[PDB]
Amino acid sequence: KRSGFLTLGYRGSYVARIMVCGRIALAKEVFGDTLNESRDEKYTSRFYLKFTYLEQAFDRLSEAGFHMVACNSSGTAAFYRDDKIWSSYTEYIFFRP
Amino acid sequence: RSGFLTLGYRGSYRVARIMVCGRIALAKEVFGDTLNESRDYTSRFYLKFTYLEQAFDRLSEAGFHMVACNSSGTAAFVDKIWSSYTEYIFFRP
Amino acid sequence: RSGFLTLGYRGSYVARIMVCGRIALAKEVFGDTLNSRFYLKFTYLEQAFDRLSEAGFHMVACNSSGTAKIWSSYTEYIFFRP
Amino acid sequence: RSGFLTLGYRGSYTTARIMVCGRIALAKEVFGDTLNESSRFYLKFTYLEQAFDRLSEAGFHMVACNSSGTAAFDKIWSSYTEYIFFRP
């Protein structure tokens, strides 16, 4: 089935890492040869994106017919007391009918 | 004087409740009489007459900084209707 | 699944360990509860970090403030699960 | 003669200057020429153990301790501990 979900993970710290989770057939259709599997899962796996920024991944998902459904963001900071270093991780859940 | 404060915002995209968890001394110092205990979320404390932006101003003037955060927002068929629940962790040295 | 958990306790170096967060996350991690300012509280040997570590939570922040003689401190631990 | 003094200490123990807060008369008496203007000052040629000895020999007792530590992704820890001393 061409329908399904695709989770887009982004681990940033304010060249980051972009993750793609979901069925393999859906990941290869939207992202092509930018996938890099890292198993750590039946018919689904997690991939890392090369030669692709976050905005480009959105354009690939938008043209493929996916829409953002859920978004799980979380960040933690560490300290003088005015300057902090944030380390966030966001998951954008996309779905295609 | 030092310690943590937790905010629990459950909004949509203005009728959102703001849960507060932490020491009673720090919560009373920042929010004052806007603290209320629901006699009906492990703290049962919420904020009256206070939006999320106003809660950030009270924490900033009191000397608290956002050290951690975790948001989770879903969407239903409607653009769309987004329902997000966010937990803010504030800390004052 | 995700969320924060806070463990605050007033000791004299030990009283109850108050728990902050959601009731769903509190009962999922702990088999103990109660009825600071927190409705739920755990009274144990302070080895609840294991019940938090294997459950998926990690210590992300900590703050201990004590005053004097005998010291009366109040420590707050911040745990988070992705 | 009597007053308060605070010793700020910052560290970064992943997976260290010393600050002094108080009156210039009390800070100059305890730490001599080790403190420099940053009132607030920072110490040189002095560790945390030696700073406690200078306050102990001067008559200051530790009355408060506020230790804090924040982490960020097995992570980068940023700890800040200040000791509040007082002499009658």
Write up this protein.
- The structure is a homotetramer.
- By secondary structure, chain A is α+β, with helices and mostly antiparallel strands.
- Chain A has one domain.
- In chain A, 19% of the residues lie in helices and 47% in strands.
- Chain A contains two helices and five strands; from the N terminus they run ββαβαββ.
- The first copy, chain A, has helices at 24-31, 54-63, and strands spanning 4-13, 17-23, 44-48, 67-78, 85-96.
- A five-stranded antiparallel beta sheet of chain A has the order 3-2-1-5-4.
- In chain A, a hairpin with a 3-residue loop joins strand 1 (4-13) and strand 2 (17-23).
- The longest helix of chain A has 10 residues, at 54-63.
- The B-C interface holds B 1-4, 6, 8, 21-24, 27, 41-45, 67-68, 70, 72, 87, 89, 91 and C 2-4, 6, 8, 19-23, 26, 36-40, 60-61, 63, 65, 74, 76, 78, 80.
- Chain B: Interacts as a tetramer with GABRB1 and GABRB2.
- Chain B: This is BTB/POZ domain-containing protein KCTD8.
- Chain B: It is found in: Presynaptic cell membrane; Postsynaptic cell membrane.
- Chain B: Auxiliary subunit of GABA-B receptors that determine the pharmacology and kinetics of the receptor response. Increases agonist potency and markedly alter the G-protein signaling of the receptors by accelerating onset and promoting desensitization.
- Chain B: It comes from Homo sapiens (Human).
